[PDB]
């Protein structure tokens, strides 16, 4: 903020694209990431910094526009090598990626400021705790237990719901609240984003959160700079709230600007044309990730699964750093199905039975044999059509396309898709299905009315017209 | 169509009368603007001689 | 004659006499060139990516000025002429012709220049680089478009702006597809151009032949692309003709414009890649999809009022904005991923898909049912399209799982067979000839048809096809109101009621 | 050609020329030194051989000792640095070395170049310009010009 | 029929643009002579006074 | 290429092979395209491209063979690239890559000369009429149609006595029209064309066509280079204002010499290896064909079937 | 190339004349992530521990002529 | 390489052959025992060809040949 008078320049040295070529004083030295101004003819730009190179010159980064500029131009400097004002005012008003209100709103917002840089809790410093979360989700509520602080995985590319599935991520994210947190997303398209304003206008929380929200056309520098807004932007609350809760977007982005740039560094690609620290860089950001005995946070999050190809060693370091996590099924989309999840993929570390009781850990076990069976036979069948179905197997096989069919329900705030609504869901009621499934308790039960329906009661009402 | 077509021929040759002809005002204008662009000097007396 | 009237006004602009600049300026030699790219000399300060005059006029994309010397990328000729000249630079990179004045002409996709005529007037030079319109700006559009394919409209609406997918397949009518639609626009309200990478002098040549066959070819106009064409103007051309939409859209008004095949694009821009050298991606690919796409798709738009204000500089004081567009994908071997086409399927709003089989069977739609949707949905769906219209959506899906059924024994009867039959049938009736323009009118026609069924189980196939065209027919000798309905948004029960005495009373006809 | 590469070495050059003020005495090494590079059937010979040491002994050798021990030592970096082969390069950028600090030259307008110097452009320069008086001599000026602002004027016609 | 008149309008005015290029040519090399013609050095000592 | 008198020296650089590495005057030097020839013991030498190097010298390559090497080496420069005299009187008459007259020399007099690497578009050029070819097969044309001009693509194969089908493509040019176009086939079986030759004897039609083949025992340079000799050739006939369609071979043949030059390049293949550019030279190729407005070139073509991939 | 210093160029300019001062202790050139083209400490032992900045101490496995760096 | 390349050493100066790839052709040696590079394999001390020739080759042309209805064994 204060001058910053003076300082001389750097000249620019070299045009290679966006990547800075430029050299300035002997004594001219900054920090891996340092403050340097410059104004392009329209205005102050920065570069962000440069590794290490000599003679003054160093390259260095943007989040502006290269094209347009003279060589050998000079540039400026300024003393903080980053600094992010730390508001809890911010929950206003969006901000730019230089926090510059993205809201009309011009915001004093606060003194404090923060940096990239930030760091991890001692050994014993987190806290670490059981609570957990339980909600309208069919199964994976059901399915899978979540505790509180747990950092929810996405997977899959877009596509899937991406955004619509992660509209539902959305709507139980949204369904409850009984806190403050706050999300935002990046690289990311408009539609979504301008609704979720008119919407958070009509909605009116914006009080309770603001957030930044990048964009897709976005330059890469601050595409990656945005990372740092996220950590930045906890520690206030962290350090504010001891509790908070968010969503993480395009992170397949995030990989992407980076490998992208990095033979750009002059860097030769990890595999796949990977970019070579991409796992450190990994490590960083999940690293950025904690929840600590002073406070905890959660929130889940989102990269674009690249392609459905597993072996992804991104996908590597997503199980890896893996907290929590989703999977979906193109073949059960493909099935037309709403839901769409991979349920025999998915799984809850938390999951635990003795915290279960038997009796989930043990239902959940069994339909986790009928997919098996299901899966198992599901050969023998296309070879053979069904005509020699082994009685007890044909039955099982009833209940299976049944069970699956089963899953579905609808939910209240889906009424805009498929204009049908829904509803939220109750555990026991749950439960229950569980037994009569077992027991396929309705013998006479019908296979469509399974499908995207109310309860046994409901499915009752349906089974009395349908 | 045909019928529009031949008249259109038509109109094709008496405009190649037109521009031969022409081709004398064109001789004119030429000179006229060898004059103004030379932005020099004016002598009219030599004959380029062109068609 | 007429034209030495031309002479003295080329005279007049010839007055505007001479004057000289830059003895030394920045020239420079172009060292040496592979293809339009040089070693070169001279002119180091320039702004960053500034395009370079050459002969025959020719500006130059160089995108790398090392510390010391550097390389420029031609368009046009590349073997015009030998190396080591002294350099010419235009002042503006990305300079051209800004105005919509001139229309509906065929130039040069990056000249000016084509048959016939090429003098043509320009508000002044534009730029394809542009930076995101304001998001807090937008106008959510309930502009409804007009398919004028029967049933198409019906399986999603179209409001002006959104990411708009077709597949593509070769030989599919891909080509063909319904590109055509433009007549379904016989009152554009909007101006639309259609873009075709490398394409084949007989097909851009037929699109002409036809072009005002269905009449004004003026209306809208598109930009010339060829096989031979460099990605100078290859790679770099679909991007190229962007900022045209500025005119309309920056004059606040909605506009489309269709491009596909951008695959070509890809190994185009690839082969640049060689060049860079640098290292490629699966399939020879780097991210700058993402970058070019980003740079291609984040074009549409519509826009807040006061954001035109703004646009307008006041000028139109806040007219809204809006932008629309056509893409399609092609399909190589129809495979799902397709890597890029998963990239871009990413970017898209909407997804069109084609059915193999049906045009394959000679269906004459073969667009893939359900395979592909719009997200944006069906905003815009009149209270009557909106309102009537639905079940087919998911029904459709039903026949066709319905259709899953392999052809068991009689069963479930009408649960089964009805379902099916109405399904079979109804693809039947659905189904639109080639160079056939839909009619809002055969909307209603078509919504009526099953308001019920007042008709559904009434005739067979043949009969179906007869007695339909029968039905159309009938109606106009019966009603012209309908023409203030047609006229109308409709959905009322009062209209609902009229159509229904209106609707059994067709049972006069055959 | 690197020539570049010029700078860490042609760099230090100024400044030992600076400090050295050699720049006389300098200059008069690099003269020296282009020469002694020049030489072909030297040059043949010059690649010839790996050992550097035989080569600052061969080539300082039959120098004729206009050599410097500043320039001895640092011809050994030369040689260690084995680049040196291309160095009468660096004279060339020692020109704009030692033109660099204080000098002018001229570009011909459409004659022959002054190479006056005149340090202030379009000032000095133009006291060039007036300096004509030297308006004499023609030496291709006037197709030049008549031709150049011709070409704009073609241009022109293109444009007409 | 009637487009294909538009069409020979403008191809026919195109000729005579072309023909008026050419005459451009032709125009330039009487320039030629116009150079040839009524050339001082006096004339370039005013293009020396231009300085 | 040269109107040519003197045209240098310049020296031969390096030299791998096919490589070339040499230089000329410090001045100037020819195109790509254009080229330049060195009496070399027996005989001159040409090389193709040299694309962009310096000191004159610059990067080279040629069909011919390269034993007998010297270091010091003198090219005379040839200009206006790949002028060649083509004459009507070739029909039936055959000639080398060179136009050598490669058989027992018909000894082939020819007033024609023009480089191959004319460009053949025009916007707007040719004719809106979109007329099909008439072929009066009792099947292949009735069954199917045929359009003037147009390209035509092949399956069948060994054993289907093609050339069955070109001899009526014989009775059928003649018969049909005057029009009359010749094909050449290049990396092939030789015996192949011999018997086709005295086929032609036996067809004795050969007159009104002839063509050099390249038959596989040949460098590429020359091979690669062979397309733009026939793409002259008829444009002597399409350019005659005439009209025609000559048949074409193993076009995989064609494009994998492709790679085998862009490896030759030193320069990044395409994907699974193509020629980084290949889809560059199909530009080349199927650009080239058109019914003219006063012309038409149709053509049809069997490719090296790999796998069928 | 890895000669680079040239302002050390003016010193080794005629300092290509003297030179004989093995430190234990020489500048660390630049470096990247840890890793350090550097110069000095003029013996060498192979993976040897060395000091730095702090109590951290590095090591260089590869023996790189004229200099060598490590992270 | 040709030969035993492991012996010899460097700066070996330069022996020169014009020659290239020159093995003596005739029939008179047939049938003989044949190193490689030479006949010498054979037990044989001399052998007997016409004289010395060269690995390059031309094939001759396509339009001479002798279609074979030799049957073989
Ligand atoms: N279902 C259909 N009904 C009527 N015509 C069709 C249908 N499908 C394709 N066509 C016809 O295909 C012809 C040309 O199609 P087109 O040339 O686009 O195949 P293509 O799309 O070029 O190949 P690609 O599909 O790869 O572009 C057009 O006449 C179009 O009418
Ligand atoms: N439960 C669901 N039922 C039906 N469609 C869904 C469901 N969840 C997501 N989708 C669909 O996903 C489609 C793609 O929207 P989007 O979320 O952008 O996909 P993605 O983000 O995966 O690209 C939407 O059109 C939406 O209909």
């Known amino acids: 903020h204060h001058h910053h008078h003076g300082m001389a320049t750097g000249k620019i040295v070299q045009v290679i694209g966006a990547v800075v070529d430029v050299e300035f004083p002997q004594d001219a030295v900054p920090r891996v990431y340092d403050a340097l101004e410059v104004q392009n003819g329209n205005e102050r730009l920065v570069l962000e910094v440069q590794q290490q190179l000599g003679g003054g010159i160093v390259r260095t980064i943007a989040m502006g526009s290269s094209d347009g500029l003279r060589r050998g131009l000079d540039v400026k400097d300024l003393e903080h090598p980053i600094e992010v004002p730390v508001g809890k005012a911010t929950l206003g008003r969006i901000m730019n990626v230089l926090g510059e209100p993205v809201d009309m709103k011009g915001e004093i917002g606060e003194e404090e400021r923060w940096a990239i840089h930030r760091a991890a809790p001692s050994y014993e410093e987190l806290s670490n705790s059981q609570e957990l979360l339980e909600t309208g989700i069919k199964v994976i509520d059901l399915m899978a237990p979540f505790a509180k602080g747990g950092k929810v995985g996405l997977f899959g590319g877009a596509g899937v719901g991406k955004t619509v599935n992660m509209m539902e991520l959305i709507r139980n994210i949204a369904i409850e609240h009984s806190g403050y947190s706050v999300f935002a997303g990046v690289g990311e398209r408009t539609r979504e984003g301008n609704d979720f304003y008119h919407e958070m206008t009509d909605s009116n929380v914006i009080d309770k959160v603001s957030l930044v929200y990048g964009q897709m056309n976005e330059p890469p520098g601050n595409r990656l700079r945005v990372a740092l807004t996220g950590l930045t932007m906890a520690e206030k609350f962290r350090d504010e709230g001891r509790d908070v809760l968010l969503f993480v977007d395009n992170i397949y982005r995030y990989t992407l600007a980076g490998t992208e740039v990095s033979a750009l560094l002059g860097r030769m690609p990890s595999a796949v044309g990977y970019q070579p620290t991409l796992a450190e860089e990994m490590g960083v950001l999940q690293e950025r990730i904690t929840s600590t005995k002073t406070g905890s946070i959660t929130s889940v999050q989102a990269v674009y699964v690249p392609a459905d190809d597993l072996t992804d060693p991104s996908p590597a370091t997503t199980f890896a750093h893996l907290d929590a996590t989703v999977v979906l099924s193109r073949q059960i989309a493909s099935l037309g199905i709403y839901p769409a999840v991979d349920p025999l993929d998915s799984t809850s570390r938390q999951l635990d039975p003795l915290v279960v009781g038997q009796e989930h850990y043990d239902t959940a076990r069994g339909v986790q044999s009928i997919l098996q069976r299901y899966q198992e036979l599901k050969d023998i069948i296309a070879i053979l059509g069904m005509d020699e179905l082994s009685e007890e197997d044909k039955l099982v096989v009833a209940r299976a396309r049944k069970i699956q069919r089963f899953l579905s329900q609808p939910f209240f705030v889906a009424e805009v898709f498929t204009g049908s609504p829904g509803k939220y869901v109750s555990l026991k009621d749950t439960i229950r299905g569980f037994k009569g499934i077992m027991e396929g308790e309705y013998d006479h039960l019908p296979e469509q009315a399974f499908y995207m329906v109310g309860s046994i009661e409901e499915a009752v009402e349906k089974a009395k017209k349908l | ?51 | 004659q007429l034209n030495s009237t031309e002479i003295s006004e080329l005279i007049k602009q010839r007055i505007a006499q001479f004057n000289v600049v830059s003895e030394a300026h920045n020239e420079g030699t172009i060292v040496s060139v592979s293809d339009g790219v040089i070693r070169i000399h001279g002119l180091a300060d320039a702004m960053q990516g500034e395009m370079i005059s050459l002969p025959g006029n020719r500006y130059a994309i160089a995108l790398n000025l090392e510390r010391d010397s550097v390389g420029a990328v031609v368009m046009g000729p590349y073997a015009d002429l030998a190396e080591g000249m002294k350099v010419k630079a235009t002042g503006r990179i990305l300079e051209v012709p800004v105005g919509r004045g001139l229309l509906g002409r065929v130039v040069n996709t990056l000249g000016a220049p084509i048959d016939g005529k090429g003098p043509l007037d320009h508000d002044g030079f534009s730029a394809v680089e542009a930076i995101a319109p304001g998001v807090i700006e937008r106008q959510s559009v309930d502009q409804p478009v007009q398919t004028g394919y029967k049933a198409v409209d019906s399986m999603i609406p179209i409001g002006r702006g959104q990411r708009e997918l077709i597949i593509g397949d070769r030989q599919t009518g891909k080509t063909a597809l319904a590109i055509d639609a433009i007549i379904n626009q016989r009152d554009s309200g909007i101006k639309a151009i259609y873009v075709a990478i490398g394409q084949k002098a007989s097909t851009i040549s037929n699109v002409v032949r036809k072009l005002e066959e269905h009449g004004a070819l003026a209306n809208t106009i598109v930009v010339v692309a060829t096989a031979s064409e460099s990605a100078a103007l290859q790679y770099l051309a679909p991007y190229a003709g962007a900022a045209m939409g500025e005119y309309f859209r920056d004059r606040g008004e909605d506009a489309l414009i269709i491009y596909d095949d951008l695959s070509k694009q890809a190994v185009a821009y690839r082969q640049i890649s060689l060049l860079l050298r640098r290292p490629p991606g699966r399939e020879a690919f780097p991210g700058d999809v993402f970058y070019l796409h980003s740079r291609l798709l984040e074009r549409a738009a519509r826009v807040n009022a006061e954001y035109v204000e703004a646009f307008t500089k006041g000028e139109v004081k806040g007219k809204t904005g809006s932008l629309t567009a056509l893409p399609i994908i092609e399909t190589q071997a129809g495979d799902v991923s397709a890597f890029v086409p998963t990239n871009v399927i990413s970017i898209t709003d909407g997804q069109i898909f084609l059915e193999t089989n049906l045009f394959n069977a000679g269906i004459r739609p073969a667009v893939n049912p359900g395979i592909s949707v719009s997200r944006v949905g069906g905003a815009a769906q009149t209270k009557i399209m909106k309102k009537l219209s639905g079940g087919i959506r998911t029904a459709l899906a039903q026949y066709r799982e319905l259709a899953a059924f392999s052809q068991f024994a009689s069963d479930l009867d009408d649960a089964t067979r009805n379902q099916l039959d109405h399904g079979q049938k109804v693809t039947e009736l659905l189904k639109q000839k080639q160079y056939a323009p839909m009619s809002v009118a055969q909307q209603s026609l078509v919504l009526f048809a099953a308001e019920r069924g007042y008709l559904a189980d009434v005739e067979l196939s043949k009969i179906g096809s007869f007695e339909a065209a029968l039905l159309a027919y009938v109606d106009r000798d019966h009603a012209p109101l309908m023409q203030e309905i047609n006229q109308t948004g409709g959905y009322n029960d009062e209209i609902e009621g009229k159509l229904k005495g209106i609707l059994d009373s067709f049972k006069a006809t055959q | 050609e690197f020539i570049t590469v010029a700078r860490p070495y042609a760099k230090a050059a100024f400044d030992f020329a600076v400090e050295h003020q050699s720049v006389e005495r300098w200059q008069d090494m690099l003269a020296f030194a282009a020469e002694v590079t020049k030489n072909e059937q030297m040059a043949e010979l010059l690649s010839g051989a790996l050992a550097p040491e035989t080569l600052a002994e061969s080539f300082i050798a039959v120098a004729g000792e206009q050599l410097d021990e500043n320039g001895q030592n640092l011809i050994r970096v030369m040689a260690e640095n084995g680049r040196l082969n291309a160095l009468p390069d660096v004279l060339e950028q020692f020109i704009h070395l030692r033109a660099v600090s204080e000098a002018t030259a001229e570009v011909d307008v459409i004659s022959a170049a002054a190479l006056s110097e005149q340090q202030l452009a379009k000032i000095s320069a133009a006291m060039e310009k007036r300096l004509s008086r030297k308006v004499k001599l023609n030496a291709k000026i006037d197709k030049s010009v008549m031709a150049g602002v011709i070409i704009r004027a073609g241009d022109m016609v293109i444009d007409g």
């Open chain 2, 1 to 51: 169509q045909a019928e529009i077509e031949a008249e259109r021929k038509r109109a094709r040759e008496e405009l190649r009368k037109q521009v031969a002809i022409l081709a004398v005002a064109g001789a004119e204008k030429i000179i006229e603007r060898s004059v103004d662009e030379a932005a020099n000097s004016d002598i009219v007396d030599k004959l380029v001689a062109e068609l």
